[PDB]
Every structure is written in structure tokens, then in C-alpha cells.
Design an enzyme around this catalytic site. Sequence first.
Site, PDB file in Angstrom:
ATOM      1  N   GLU A  11      46.169  39.187  45.721  1.00 45.53           N
ATOM      2  CA  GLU A  11      46.637  38.196  44.768  1.00 45.53           C
ATOM      3  C   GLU A  11      47.798  38.636  43.896  1.00 45.53           C
ATOM      4  O   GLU A  11      48.557  37.852  43.401  1.00 45.53           O
ATOM      5  CB  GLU A  11      45.508  37.952  43.779  1.00 45.53           C
ATOM      6  CG  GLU A  11      44.249  37.362  44.378  1.00 45.53           C
ATOM      7  CD  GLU A  11      44.364  35.924  44.779  1.00 45.53           C
ATOM      8  OE1 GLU A  11      43.598  35.405  45.538  1.00 45.53           O
ATOM      9  OE2 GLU A  11      45.338  35.287  44.215  1.00 45.53           O
ATOM     10  N   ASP A  20      51.500  29.169  42.468  1.00 47.33           N
ATOM     11  CA  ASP A  20      50.707  29.607  43.554  1.00 47.33           C
ATOM     12  C   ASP A  20      51.390  29.187  44.814  1.00 47.33           C
ATOM     13  O   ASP A  20      52.480  28.627  44.788  1.00 47.33           O
ATOM     14  CB  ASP A  20      49.203  29.247  43.256  1.00 47.33           C
ATOM     15  CG  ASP A  20      48.401  28.299  44.101  1.00 47.33           C
ATOM     16  OD1 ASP A  20      47.186  28.270  43.994  1.00 47.33           O
ATOM     17  OD2 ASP A  20      49.102  27.518  44.896  1.00 47.33           O
TER      18      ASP A  20
END
Length: 164
Positions: A11, A20
Site C-alpha cells: 500500500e 487511490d
Amino acid sequence: MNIFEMLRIDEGLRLKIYKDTEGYYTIGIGHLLTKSPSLNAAKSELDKAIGRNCNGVITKDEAEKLFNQDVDAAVRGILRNAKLKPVYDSLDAVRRCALINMVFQMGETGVAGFTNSLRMLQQKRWDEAAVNLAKSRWYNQTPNRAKRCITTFRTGTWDAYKNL
């Protein structure tokens, strides 16, 4: 290698709101803030989450705090889920980490929908399950991270991250 280090690789760490892969507002270590198009919806969600006026930015500590919360919520989610629980109990420790990893990324509901793949993991049909998990949107959208995760399921080793 543990679940936390593993998710930190997948991540990244971002101390400023961001988007994102999907178009969504995120911050820290994959902490989804909102699927809403408002930078303003995201900043409000962020202050509520942190308990301070952040003005779209947070500290390391804060991001780690959010991270501890998320993995924890991901574990309790799998443990309380009638679809997920059995698969998890059936698995070795490394492959368990791979299910936590999917669950932190796509949510409970998401993974619970990978019915076939779940049935194969439970049956210990490794190669077959690997191939099945790849036939998903998850894999087409974020291929390199999905591949690392799929390899962990396929082999039961931390090889894919050992590089990283």
C-alpha cells in the site's frame, strides 16, 4: 516478514490525502476515506477519523494508528464471517496473512464473493486457486500487488516480497 510489513509494501505510506488507484480518496497506509468525489467529503472524514483538524495532512504516528485499527478490523472481520472463518482456520500461517491482505484491500464482502477460489483454498488446491484468483477485476486493476498476494497463496512462502 509479518502482515504489517507485508501491507506496508503493498500500500505504501502517504501522509497527504490522495487518490487511490480507483479514484478514491485515501491517506496513510491504504486507509480509504471515502468513495465520494468531494475533496471536502474526504477532509471531513479525515478529521472525524483522526479527532483533530488535519486539513488533509497527517503525521506518521497517526497513519500507523489508522493502520493498527485496520488490520485489527480486518482480522475480526474474517473471524466473524461465516464464509471466511473456516477458510482461515484451515490455513497455514503464511497463507493466513494472504487472506488478511485481500480482506484489508477489498473488504469482507468483496472476498467473501470469491466463492470458488475460497472453496479451492479450503481444499488445499493451490495452483488451481492461484489461477482462479487471477481471473478477477482485482488482478486486472492492480496486477503487481495481486500477483504478490496470489503467489503467497500458491506457495505458502514469503518469496514474492522477499525481493521488495
